Amino acid sequence: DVEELLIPKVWVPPEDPLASPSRLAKFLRENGYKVLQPRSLPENEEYETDQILPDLAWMRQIVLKPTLSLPIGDQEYFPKYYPTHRPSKEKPNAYPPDIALLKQMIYLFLQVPEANEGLKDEVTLLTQNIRDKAYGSGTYMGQANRLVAMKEVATGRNPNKDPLKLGYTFESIAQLLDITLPVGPPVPLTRVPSRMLVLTGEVEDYLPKINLKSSSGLPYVGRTKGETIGEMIAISNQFLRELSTLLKQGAGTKGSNKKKLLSMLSDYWYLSCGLLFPKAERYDKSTWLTKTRNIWSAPSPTHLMISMITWPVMSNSPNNVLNIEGCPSLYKFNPFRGGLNRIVEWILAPEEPKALVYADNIYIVHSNTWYSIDLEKGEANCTRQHMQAAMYYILTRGWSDNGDPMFNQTWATFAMNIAPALVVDSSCLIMNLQIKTYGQGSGNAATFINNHLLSTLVLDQWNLMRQPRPDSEEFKSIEDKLGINFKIERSIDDIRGKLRQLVLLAQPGYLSGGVEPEQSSPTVELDLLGWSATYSKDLGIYVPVLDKERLFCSAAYPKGVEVGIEQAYKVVRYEALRLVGGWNYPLLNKACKNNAGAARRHLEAKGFPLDEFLAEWSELSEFGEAFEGFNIKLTVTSESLAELNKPVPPKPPNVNRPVNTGGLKAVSNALKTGRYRNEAGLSGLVLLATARSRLQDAVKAKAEAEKLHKSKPDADWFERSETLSDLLEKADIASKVAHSALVETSDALEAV
């Protein structure tokens, strides 16, 4: 019959049946997936840097190239993006399973003098992952197939819903976000990116962070952000200077300057088209053709501009469940330094129902059960109005002093009427094809906040129907109400009981008795942002362990480097596996330790500078994000696990508003009455007017909002909204229904 092996044969991936533009187009049209009429792009051409960025000429002589490549050519082209899929039928050895690890674990199991099926399970589990899975970037057929599935989440079973058509308003959503994502203040949003680098006659840097290794996007396919820094800033400068000019000229009287705007947006279409990057991961072999995650790689200028709004506000908002009463947020949670122990105490407390949120994740305890819930592809559910609501939130509570806008009408117009259209329901480039993106793109700079807002809406609706149990028809009905798909990934009955038993049943190991473990210590697999709980007798608290399935999945298929440094990367690999949770699993632990030891001894004898290589190991590791800015060595001992886990007081919260401690229930109940305050103030009205008026009438929209605010003493919001609606129509600057400024700029982006 059939041949069985201890060590799997090298897998040969199947042939990609869509590796051609003719076949891809055929498949998309077949499934009624929209293909756009292709727009072209001016060829990139060399230009002297000191002529485009004169106010940054000082940083060249005391940096970046002297010439910039700009999309300004006479001859045009249609852009092409052809990602390289690894591994493949032709080239199958890109990402081998860790056979050395498997052999070591088998070797050590054989040395143990008897029995022990509990040790053998480690071998069984690693072997099962090596067989079932493969690491790499899948296939075109998989990418395409994934695309068809989001067109389904967005337009099929439960089509996306504009939340404003459901009764929500910008302000009502913001007040939910006051609870679920509290934000503090960051220089005002009034400058082009060039003026975000100041010289004191030292230099001050106010520009967001971006990884120099990621792809630049349009118009620089095949180039990194690191190779296009000057260009990225140049294009953002140009774009914003043009927009402010347009807003300064206004509506030409009578609608003349309406062909300036369409001209500009059409010329900047490429700012709304992401590269469809195949996301590398541990996929199931059986679904190599039907499942490949995609990353929508934003054009680098679109990314710079959007994150100039989001980053400074979010990068100094460490506000969550740990440091604000009633806050459900897990934003910037870290399980080390007593982190996890504190969440477990939160679970253990008798209060229920209660909720936690992080982007597209909702954790609920109800009737002594723990429920982990995911939004079914968050991004795909997102509409433009969801994102403009996120923008409205960030500006009114991040970019405002008391209610006074700390932003231009230029930046206001970009935020409310351009950025959602660039990045939600726009387009993407795969092979040579320009095709629709349904929902928000997986890669963009507002992903976290847009998803977080989506989950916030789910929670609001959960509160509104008296907090039903998550596995009930009642809870399920929320998806119809909101057009937001979700599922239960996992639930755990008798959650408190199980968490309490961890204390009773903890086994000797590095964190209980300070010894090398003979036996695995029990856990509760919470999947709390990927973390489990276990009990440390040495510290007397709960400590994190990586979720067991994730851990063995990672062990099975290491990520690539993608002379001498190969042994050094193995030290990182194996020690980090231990550090994140391998320490709690006996065979995994020792095998990783032995293999790391052999790589270390090989390097010491060759005089390799290991200490220097590992100085910033966090960047070299798939787990590093959890260890960022802790300045800890890679060693894994009793002392290091203890030091990593030693409780540290949570840093104080940073809120730009008086701290709201009522909890989400109260704000939900107050809000269903349709009567609430304008907690946003003037900038709230400014942004309303900006959203509700034609794009080129933005300056007038603000002035009209300033007159209404001057009109008193804001109190009731709904009244305030309706009076401002009358003022906009009387000046004839308000746009017609179903022809909002947002819709206009979207249409002009797929003009051509």
UniProtKB/Swiss-Prot annotation:
This is RNA-directed RNA polymerase. Keywords: Covalent protein-RNA linkage, GTP-binding, Nucleotide-binding, Nucleotidyltransferase, Phosphoprotein, RNA-directed RNA polymerase, Transferase, Viral RNA replication, Virion. Its EC number is 2.7.7.48. It comes from the Viruses. InterPro entries: Avibirnavurs_RdRp_C_sf, Birnavirus_RdRp_C, Birnavirus_RdRp_palm, Birnavirus_RdRp_palm_sf, Birnavirus_RdRp_thumb, Birnavirus_RdRp_thumb_sf, DNA/RNA_pol_sf. It is found in: Virion. It holds the Pfam family Birna_RdRp_palm. The keyword Transferase applies. It catalyses: RNA(n) + a ribonucleoside 5'-triphosphate = RNA(n+1) + diphosphate. May exist in multiple phosphorylated forms.
